[model samples]
Target: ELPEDPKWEFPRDKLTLGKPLGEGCFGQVVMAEAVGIDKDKPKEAVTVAVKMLKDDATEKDLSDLVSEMEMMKMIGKHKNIIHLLGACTQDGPLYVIVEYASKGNLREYLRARREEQMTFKDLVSCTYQLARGMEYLASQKCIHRDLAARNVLVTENNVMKIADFGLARVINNIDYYGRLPVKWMAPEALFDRVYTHQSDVWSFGVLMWEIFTLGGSPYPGIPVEELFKLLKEGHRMDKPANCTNELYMMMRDCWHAVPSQRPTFKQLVEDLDRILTLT
Candidate 1:
C-alpha cells in the first residue's frame, strides 16, 4: 500500500501537478510547479518534472532508486546534467524533482521537425552540444547508461542537457551492471559484456543516426536481436541521402564493432565543432 499523506514530505504544497509529460518502465513524469509563487506570475513558480515510482516497487527496485538518488546528488550540479531540485521519499510513492525543459526531449522535438527541412549547420550544432555533454559526464567518471535523443532535453535557448539518469551508474564501481536500453545499446552492451566509457561512444553513433534522420527509429525494419548480430559482425546503418560525407564518416567511426576503437567524447566534440564551423 502507498504511504499516508502525513508521511509525505519534500515541498508538495508548492507543486501543482499538471499533465503527464512522459512514461517509462520505472515511472511517469508530470509537469509541476514549485511552491510560494503567485498563480498570476507563472514564471515565478519554478517549473519541475516529477517522476514517481509505483507503490509496490520491490527491494531491488528501491535499491536502484536509492542508487539513482545518490548518483544525482553527486552529478546533478553539472552544467550539462539535469538539475535535481528535490525529492520525496517519506510519501507513499517516492518522487524525484528536476528542472523542466519546456522544449521537451530531443526525440520528440526531432520527430516534430522531421518533415521540415533543417539546415546542416543546425544539426551539427545540436550534435556538438550532445558531444559536449557526453564529454563532461565521461570526465566525471559517470556512465549515462541511456544516451539517446529521448534522454536529451532541449532548452528554450537551444541548449541541450542530458537527463534521465535513473539508469546511470558510477563507472569506477566494479560491481556495477550496466542496464542500458536495448535499441540504443552498443555492441558490447548487446552481447552482455561489461560496459566502459568506450561503449558510450558506440551509443553516440546511434544518437548521431537519430539526429541525422530527424529522430527516425533505430533499426526500423530489422529485428532487435538480428540488429545486434549484424552490429557484432561489424555492420552499421548506411548513411541517409541527406547526410554529408563528413558526418557519415563520423557515425561510422562511432559505430565501430570494437568499442576501444571508438573516438573519445572529447575528440567527438572537437570533430563536431569542426563540422559545424564548416557548415
Candidate 2:
C-alpha cells in the first residue's frame, strides 16, 4: 500500500538507526537520521522517528504497518498531527519515518515536572492545542481510537502533536478486545466495537483528567473489568483536585451516555479557545 509518489520511498542505505525510543508487542520506534529526506536539503541529515516491526512479526503485522502508513499519507500535513516523512518499504523491513517530537509523550512530560506547579494556563493551553489537532483529524474523517496523554507528543515549545495512529480508523472503519486501553475508552467503544469522533471525545476527557492530575491513572484504583459497570451506573471519575470546576464540567459533558450529546471536536476547540483566553 505504498504511495504512488517516488519521494515517499526512502532509501534504506541513507538511514542511520539509533536506540529505541519505545517498543510494543510487535513493533518498535527508534531514533534515526535520514540523509536528505527533504529535496531542498540534499546533504543534510534530519532526525526522525522510525517505526518498524520485530523480526518475528507475522504477515498481519506487516499488513497493519502498511495500513498505518496509508492512513498517514491520506492525512497529509497538519501542525498538530505528526508528519510522516518517508518510509523504507521496497527492499528491507518496513520503516515508517516521521518527524520527531523532542519533548516525548505528554504523560511522561507532566510526571517529570512533579516538583514544579502546573499552572491553570498551562493546562488550558495543552487542551486547546489538542482540540485544534483533533478538529483537523475530524475534518479528514480520521478517528483516533486511542486518544490519551500517553499517545500525545510534545514538541520544543510544548506544542501538542497527536501520535500513534496504529489504532486509528478512518471514521467509517477493529480488533475491539485484545490489549486495548479500557480506562480511556467511551462506553460504546468499551462495550461495542463501534467508534466515532464521539468516542475520541470521551477519551479526550479522560486525557484531560490525566493532564490535570499530572499523569494520574484514570479511575484511580478501579480495575479494568469494573470500569464498564461503574460507567454504566453513572460513576464517572471525579474532578481531579487541581482541575477547575468549569473544565471538569466539560469533561462530564464528554462522558454523556449518548454519543450524539458529546461535544464536537470543533466545538471543543472553540470552548478551549475561550478558556485559554480567560485563563
Candidate 3:
C-alpha cells in the first residue's frame, strides 16, 4: 500500500537510483540506472539518460520544478515530447523521473558541429520533426512559452523531442507578466504583455532562425533593449545566406506582427512537411 504522505513514496525500487550525473544550483543529479540491473556486470550497464531530483534543495526550487513537473505530466506521452516515468516528494527537494535523451540538448549538439555539418535534407527533416512535436503540443491547447533549441533534447538515434516545460501553462484566458525569451519574444508578448500559442509561433520562428544559422545567436551584436526597439519598429529577423527561400519565408510568416496572422502549429507542420517532400 502507498503511504498517505505520498511525497516520500518513490516508486520502482529495483532501479534504486545510483551515482551523480551532473550538478546544478539546487542539488547534484546522480546516475539512476536500470539497464542490466545485476551485480555481476556493473560495467556493462547501459547508462540511460533518466534523471532524479535530490533532497536538501530549497523550497522555492521545489515549487518551480513542481510547476514544470505538472506541465510535463500534462504533455508527456507523445513520442516527440519528454515522458515522465515517475517522481518523489516524501523526504525533501522532490524528484521527477523522466525518459533519457542520450544525445543531450539540441543547442549543444548544434554548437558542437564546428567540425561537422548536416546535409540539407537531414536539417529539413530535423526541423520538420520538431514542428510535428509542436503540432502535438498545440493540439492539447498548451503554450510552451519557452521554445528553443536549448529546450529541445536529442536521443541516441538522433530523435528530437521537445523538453523543458518550466514555462508551459494553459494561460489560454489570462496574460500579463511573463519571463519571455527576450530575443524570441513576440511583438505582442513584448509590448502588450500578451501570450498565446501564437506567441509561441513567434518564438518558433526565432528557433527556425537558430536552426538555419547553425546555432548562431539571434540578433547578433544587437543590444537587448535595442533589439526590442527594432522589433517594435516592425523589423523581423533576416534570412540566413544559404537557407532555402521557402524555409526563410516560413520563418517570416511566423514572425507576423499580429498574433492572429501568425501561422498555427498545424500550419507550420503542414508547410514544413510540404517543403520537405519537394527536396
Candidate 4:
C-alpha cells in the first residue's frame, strides 16, 4: 500500500514533470516521480505519472474526471491496475497522481525496443497481465471503454497495469458510446452506437495488435474517417504473422460483427491462461 500522504505533499513539487510522455485528444501525460528504490528498503520515493486536464474543461468533463478518480479509488487495490496515490486539485489545475511507471506506457516501451527486445513470450506476458486487469475491471461491472497500448503502463518488473479510465463507463446505465480513439475503438463504438462489455472485448482485440507489433500504429496509413467507414463496411485489421493462431482466432471472435458473439472478459482470461500454458 502507498502512503496516504507522502513528505513532498504536492504532486508537481516532488516529481519534476519531464517531457510530454504522450498526448490524446482531451489531455496530456508527463513523466513524474518514479517510485521504489532498493528492494531491501522500504519502497519510498516512488515515481508517479501525472495527467493534467485542459483548463477549459466543462462540467461534464469534470464529472468524467471525478468519475475516473472514483473508479480508480475503487479498483486501485488490484495488482494489475495502476495505483492511484493522491490527487491535487486545490491549487490551480487539477492533477491525477498515479504510480510512476519507469518504463513508460507500453506503446513507447514497445517502440523503443522495436524488433530486438520484445519477444513473443514478452507479448504473452503483457497480454496476460492486461487480461488479469480487465477481468478485475469486469468483475466490478466497469467497462474500460478504451483498452490499448497507450493505456497500459509498464513497471520495471515487466508488470503491466491498466490505466486511463477517462473514457470508461459503468456497465449498467451506459447507453451512448462515448467518443473513443477511433483507431483503438471497437466497431460498435466507432459507429456512434451503444457500448457494452462486449464492445470492450473488441477494443482488447486492437490492444493485442498493439502489443504484438511493438506498438505499431493501429491503422498505419488509414485516416480516422476512412477507418470508421471501413469498419462500418465490415472490414477489420488483418492479423499479423507474429500473433499466434489461437490468439488471432480469439481476437477475431472478439471482433465478430455481432457483439453478442464476443466472449466475456472472464472467457478471455481463461483463454489467455490456456494460451500461456501452451506457449
Candidate maximizing lDDT: 2
Model 4 gets an lDDT of: 0.75
Q: Which parts of model 1 are misplaced by more than 4 Å?
A: 1-10, 36-43, 55-61, 115-117, 173-179
- The parts of candidate 4 lying over 4 Å away from their true place are 1-43, 53-64, 89-93, 173-178
lDDT of 2 by residue, 75-180 (tens): 8799888899998877567888988888889988999877456787898888899989999998888888889888888887788999888788775433223445
Per-prediction TM-score to the true structure, in the order listed: 0.85, 0.92, 0.84, 0.81
Write candidate 3's Cα lDDT for 166-269 as tens digits.
67776555553446679988888788887888888899888888877767789888888788678868877778875888889889989888888999889888
Steric clash pairs (candidate 4):
33-47, 33-48, 34-47, 35-46, 35-47, 47-100, 48-100
Write model 1 residue lDDT over 65-129, tens digit each, in one string: 66676687776466666777677766456777777788888888887876455777778888898
Off by over 4 Å in 3: 1-13, 16-30, 35-57, 173-178
TM-score leaderboard ranking: 2, 1, 3, 4
Model 4: number of clashes? 7
| Residue 200, model 2: Cα distance from true site in angstroms | 0.9
Report how far residue 179 has shifted in candidate 1, in Å: 4.3
Of candidate 1, the 10-residue stretch with the lowest lDDT total is 1-10
The model with the greatest TM-score is 2
Q: Tally clashes: model 3.
A: 8
CA-lDDT, candidates in order: 0.76, 0.85, 0.73, 0.75
